[PDB]
Design a protein around this ligand. Structure first.
Ligand SMILES: O=S(=O)(O)O[C@@H]1[C@H](O[C@H]2O[C@@H]3CO[C@@H]([C@H]3O[C@@H]3O[C@H](CO)[C@H](OS(=O)(=O)O)[C@H](O[C@H]4O[C@@H]5CO[C@@H]([C@H]5O)[C@H]4OS(=O)(=O)O)[C@H]3O)[C@H]2OS(=O)(=O)O)[C@@H](O)[C@H](O)O[C@@H]1CO
Ligand SMILES: O=S(=O)(O)O[C@@H]1[C@H](O[C@H]2O[C@@H]3CO[C@@H]([C@H]3O[C@@H]3O[C@H](CO)[C@H](OS(=O)(=O)O)[C@H](O[C@H]4O[C@@H]5CO[C@@H]([C@H]5O)[C@H]4OS(=O)(=O)O)[C@H]3O)[C@H]2OS(=O)(=O)O)[C@@H](O)[C@H](O)O[C@@H]1CO
Ligand SMILES: O=S(=O)(O)O[C@@H]1[C@H](O[C@H]2O[C@@H]3CO[C@@H]([C@H]3O[C@@H]3O[C@H](CO)[C@H](OS(=O)(=O)O)[C@H](O[C@H]4O[C@@H]5CO[C@@H]([C@H]5O)[C@H]4OS(=O)(=O)O)[C@H]3O)[C@H]2OS(=O)(=O)O)[C@@H](O)[C@H](O)O[C@@H]1CO
Ligand SMILES: O=S(=O)(O)O[C@@H]1[C@H](O[C@H]2O[C@@H]3CO[C@@H]([C@H]3O[C@@H]3O[C@H](CO)[C@H](OS(=O)(=O)O)[C@H](O[C@H]4O[C@@H]5CO[C@@H]([C@H]5O)[C@H]4OS(=O)(=O)O)[C@H]3O)[C@H]2OS(=O)(=O)O)[C@@H](O)[C@H](O)O[C@@H]1CO
Ligand SMILES: O=S(=O)(O)O[C@@H]1[C@H](O[C@H]2O[C@@H]3CO[C@@H]([C@H]3O[C@@H]3O[C@H](CO)[C@H](OS(=O)(=O)O)[C@H](O[C@H]4O[C@@H]5CO[C@@H]([C@H]5O)[C@H]4OS(=O)(=O)O)[C@H]3O)[C@H]2OS(=O)(=O)O)[C@@H](O)[C@H](O)O[C@@H]1CO
Ligand SMILES: [Ca+2]
Ligand SMILES: [Ca+2]
Ligand SMILES: [Ca+2]
Lengths: 452, 452, 452
């Protein structure tokens, strides 16, 4: 039989905020179990250092730049989204006989054609925008008050959740709610001859910082208020993963299920997170912004107790899942990742002599990153290109560009070459951001790929 | 049997320039007959306050902004047009067994793929551009003189008319010519088992101001020269409508034919028109620019002698005609109107708690309008957003924004939300307009949707 | 039987640099033989005054502007190219039973979908970018040194040649190498029931100026160093044409083969060329930049010893070849040329009362050209539109605009009309060129089509 696949994605999870990736203060035993009896990844990179584009990339297998999705969708709502001509991994799997489910955060389009149920997800339970308030007792009264005033543009963090299009009245803390529905999904899946795919998109530990008192009580030694709340949010995810894991064991699903656990981007230091030993955090092209924790777990298939030290991209998940599912992939889909399993099993670099990119736009310029073999190229804050031996210098403290001029110049030029089929953005997260984009003649790649 | 449908569209007809919509000086008895034995609309809105985009919207059922058609086509000619992937209502009806005809003004593309005969019209007789000179005795000598000089770029107002692609030598005043062919069309239609659709696009009373002496003689009390000519132009349309009506009765078509009569946009005050009691006129986002006269007539179906006081959009005609014809509509067509018939028959607002928009671009900024229930939001002349209780204040004299800040802000934000899937314009009416568009980083929606 | 077709294209060949088009110093007897027993063209125009766009136009039959290909591809590499939805003439011919081959320079896209083997060429031997170093003994050591350093972005002029996707180690001077493979191609073609199409794209006499000592020895009277080298480069092409011609005769192919020989654009005066009697050279909208030498040769079909004096466009080759091959052409392909054979055989103007355009972009403005009947309109160097009787004034010395105001204005307005379906460029030859394009709000057609 072909394996079941679960992709679990935390939102704004810091590099050092789970036990298996070095957390000395937050405790995540159920997630750590999956690590201990599976393989974790010390060099795992998402395709963009924040949510919308990173998630677009997970589902499509393409850098968000190639499909006009370089920015988060408009915060106050919109009728646009990740283009429909890039087939989602869920759609492909559904076409090769998988029962498909998506839970929690979407952030890839509110309209009918961009909805999870038209991107190849049989079941969906969650909220369509960038995040959500965690307590129904807080958020449902506010929404009711505003809808009765006649307002149509309501902040999406307080709007109702939905199940396959129809609104619901959620009763639990959201992290637990999604965990409950993850159980319900795998339970529904037992009564089918088909294998299953589940995209579990937790909004924790993303703002707003809201945790159950019961979870926070587990971290009495954490004296900082925001960090303690953050910790409780993360522990709530861990309880969920443990609850899912039990349901999988109960159903004899555990053994033929590949579980991936990761973050969508780096942690935000001002909102409770820790990215040790990486520099900076969310949104940055420093390692802190797009290098994330990740583990695979699949008994008798994924090695137990290993730590894989070569680069892996979130882009690889698409063709990798497809190869494991026996689903055909077409050359016209323009996948930017690679099926990493053959290299993974031989403990070899799946991106041997090949770059992994990050390009994030700012006001009138762009920050960039390149990861190839031991090297990390970095363009940030309008400075000249720096270069790091990232294997010796994970914190990016020692720029060795002066003694590798030819190598750095080469990497940047390859990025310049790669840039040409990037589409103009189909939207921006705010109206003024698009106005400034047009005003500044963006992209200003003359600044971005100038060399020393 | 499914009903025949006639859509009659005057060009630049003022709000107060037909008898049934309050004209004290111009007399339109045959059009008034249709009103008296049918229902007129006091709150009827086109999708854009001038021709090309408004007509694009009629045919496609979509706001012109969504399909890159926010501007009139180049005045001196072009090889572009209303995109071919938006199925015209004529095409849909033709596919559900209707005999289709288009007469008069097109203004939606000169090229073969944009031609009426490829947009689902079996018969077409008219001129493809923005308007035409009215007297063949004046215009045919000028065209002949210029073609013999060897000139290829001839002002489209003097070029020959055509019938299904072949040129003709028209003998009558154009308003009468089109009326004659409207008779010919419905006559041709009797000898078929099919019902029929007719889009009669009069160019009257659009410039240039040219009328028959016989028509002007009917308005001896009109002392102003331009208004008298204008009046004669409008009376000529009325004669045409009466002539069509006779032919329909002669053929036992009258009783199972829905006739819609309306304008493409508001009247232009400097070229003879009157928009009483509305403010401003053609091209404005004030009511005068996009609120137009309209009547439905269909015996034993449309109430006789009524005046419907709730909002209706030209966008509604597409799905409304389709529902009456029993033609299926697909979610992928992205229709922006609603089938208004169910609400119409119950005398309810078909756009209850839903906005009707107008957005018209200017040099480096945009004017806008929102109509929802009793409210009219207005952005004009780079002023702050104003708000009107349009039911009490049709002339837009009393801005009540200060005492409804939350409501106004809400409406504007919904318009901001709606703006995101507007395409960049595929053309402009002049070369400099596109240059200025690019220079000004348009759209400048940061100005257009800023709130107080 | 339908005829074999060979299209031979020199790169940067000057107007006066072959014997049959007036060369007093360079000697080209084998090319001259084809002229003497065929027809040469005194008014032959490519679609754009430099390589990439001109070649795109040859293959697609469309002005490069219509398909976003107005510029040369990025010099340092890219993953974009001539769009795949414009069917190449090679593809059409392959679909109507032709054995297809492409040799030498491509300059129309490095990626798999843009590769010659996916644009309808069975065989390809050459280099994919803008040109190449001529001596393997010089270029192969440099490439080997750089590949061993680990560099991935290597100047394309020193990279290996390829044969149907696999790299090769070429042993000869490139002009001779391509000539040898042209022989190999026509030889392979004998053993097939099919006729054949061959696109022989010499990079000579394009930079860098490198010739065999043996060739240069034939021009001892040429005292200038660059001109002597240039001459040797051109003689090497002539040897190749003679070698191909022998192989064709050997195989009884000569008599039922249409050979076309031409340049991709005008000669560059600073790199050895001569465009007498034309003004300026490569890249200009003066005649020197896009009026090129051309001959047809096809015994008992093309008249022997004639000089055809009416305009012909490179755009005509597509439908002309197609008509001779009996291959159907569709209206949806939007071909911008005409099948010129019927007019050619009657010694009539195939573009009678129809313009041939050239539009080349510069820093914040564009130069333009129009050729119709005896007239040449010219916009250059930000000057006002000039007009020339090009039949009496081939060097463009006598502007007669003042006494033909109406005619000039007409031509320009038709060009303005033609401009509207030009696509925004899908790429530029350098990063800064695209930045400057966006900064300058290009195209600035308000400057380009302003009239007096
Ligand atoms: O008092 S509040 O609760 O703060 O007020 C509320 C609103 O403020 C909040 O709104 C969201 C939720 O929490 C904060 C803010 O976070 C933003 O959430 C986005 C997703 O919804 C997004 O995160 S992402 O999805 O992982 O990408 C935002 O990050 C992005 O922001 C920009 C767009 O892309 C990047 C930025 O350019 C990305 O961030 S990055 O650069 O670090 O990568 C994320 O910030 C909270 O706002 S706060 O400023 O952080 O405090 C408030 O707007 C409104 O007025 O009131 C509500 C009601 O409570
Ligand atoms: O002709 S070659 O020069 O050999 O070709 C080259 C490359 O092929 C080689 O690639 C590596 C190095 O030598 C062979 C192959 O060995 C594998 O090396 C891995 C690291 O890159 C890894 O070694 S490890 O680091 O000690 O772990 C592999 O071992 C692991 O494999 C499984 C996963 O964990 C263990 C196994 O269960 C671990 O093995 S262990 O028991 O030793 O601990 C190791 O196999 C050689 O390839 S070949 O397979 O022998 O053919 C080629 O990939 C590259 O593209 O080109 C070069 C050209 O020089
Ligand atoms: O003696 S003249 O008639 O003036 O000489 C001729 C030309 O002038 C005329 O050109 C047309 C016909 O009559 C006047 C002018 O009207 C324009 O017609 C357009 C359609 O072809 C269009 O109307 S529309 O279709 O209902 O929209 C024009 O309105 C638009 O204009 C701009 C583009 O979109 C809007 C504007 O931004 C829209 O108008 S709006 O802002 O009110 O909404 C309409 O003006 C007449 O010109 S005049 O200026 O009205 O006097 C002349 O230019 C030419 O050179 O020569 C001919 C022949 O002699
Ligand atoms: O000087 S060298 O020692 O030779 O240095 C070398 C490199 O410089 C060279 O680079 C190329 C090859 O030879 C010269 C230059 O020629 C350019 O070739 C292009 C195609 O590869 C193109 O020709 S084209 O394809 O027929 O069009 C260039 O012309 C175009 O350039 C722009 C894009 O479109 C136009 C321009 O806007 C078009 O020119 S046009 O307007 O005249 O039509 C053509 O210039 C040589 O450069 S030089 O300036 O002549 O000296 C150097 O870059 C590299 O780093 O090293 C080698 C030496 O090892
Ligand atoms: O003062 S001098 O004696 O003239 O100095 C000399 C050198 O400067 C000159 O170098 C060239 C020849 O004429 C000027 C300059 O032109 C530029 O050449 C570029 C490549 O060599 C390129 O030409 S192109 O490839 O044919 O296009 C430049 O054009 C491009 O620039 C932008 C990027 O793409 C386009 C632009 O957006 C393209 O322009 S285009 O679209 O119009 O094609 C072209 O400007 C001359 O420079 S000067 O300062 O203006 O005089 C000097 O560098 C050297 O050191 O010395 C010699 C004398 O010894
Ligand atoms: Ca996030
Ligand atoms: Ca009008
Ligand atoms: Ca060239």
């Amino acid at each position: 039989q072909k394996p079941n696949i679960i992709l679990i994605v935390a939102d704004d999870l810091g590099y050092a905020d789970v036990g298996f990736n070095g957390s000395k203060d937050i405790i995540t035993p159920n997630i750590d179990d999956l690590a201990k009896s599976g393989t974790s990844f010390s060099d795992a990179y998402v395709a963009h250092p924040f949510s919308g584009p990173s998630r677009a990339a997970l589902m499509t297998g393409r850098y968000p730049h190639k499909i006009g999705s370089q920015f988060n969708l408009p915060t106050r709502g919109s009728n646009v989204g990740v283009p429909t001509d890039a087939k989602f991994i869920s759609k492909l799997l559904n076409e090769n006989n998988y029962f498909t489910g998506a839970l929690g955060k979407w952030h890839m389009g509110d309209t009918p054609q961009h909805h999870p149920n038209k991107r190849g997800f049989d079941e969906y339970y969650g909220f369509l925008g960038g995040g959500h308030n965690y307590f129904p007792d807080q958020y449902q009264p506010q929404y009711k008050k505003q809808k009765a005033q006649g307002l149509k543009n309501i902040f999406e963090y307080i709007t109702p959740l939905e199940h396959n299009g129809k609104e619901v009245k959620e009763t639990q803390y959201i992290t637990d709610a999604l965990s409950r529905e993850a159980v319900n999904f795998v339970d529904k899946a037992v009564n089918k001859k088909h294998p299953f795919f589940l995209y579990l998109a937790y909004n924790a530990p993303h703002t707003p910082l809201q945790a159950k008192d019961e979870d926070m009580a587990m971290f009495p030694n954490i004296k900082n208020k925001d960090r303690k709340t953050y910790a409780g949010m993360v522990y709530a995810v861990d309880r969920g993963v443990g609850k899912l894991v039990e349901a999988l064991k109960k159903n004899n699903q555990y053994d033929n299920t590949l579980i991936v656990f990761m973050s969508d981007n780096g942690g935000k230091l001002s909102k409770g997170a820790n990215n040790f030993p990486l520099k900076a955090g969310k949104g940055s092209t420093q390692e802190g912004g797009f290098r994330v924790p990740m583990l695979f777990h699949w008994p008798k298939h994924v090695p137990a107790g290993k730590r894989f030290s070569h680069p892996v991209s979130a882009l690889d998940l698409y063709p990798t899942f497809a190869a494991l599912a026996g689903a055909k992939v077409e050359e016209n889909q323009h996948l930017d990742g690679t099926n990493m399993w053959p290299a993974f099993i031989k403990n070899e670099n799946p991106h041997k002599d090949e770059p992994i990119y990050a390009l994030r736009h700012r006001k009138g310029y762009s920050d960039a990153a390149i990861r190839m073999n031991q090297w990390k190229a970095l363009k940030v804050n309008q400075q000249p290109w720096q270069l790091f031996n990232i294997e010796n210098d994970i914190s990016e403290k020692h720029d060795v560009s002066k003694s590798n001029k030819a190598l750095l110049t080469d990497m940047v030029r390859e990025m310049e070459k790669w840039s040409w089929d990037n589409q103009q953005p189909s939207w921006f997260h705010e109206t003024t951001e698009g106005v400034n984009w047009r005003l500044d003649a963006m992209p200003r790649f003359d600044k971005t790929f100038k060399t020393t």
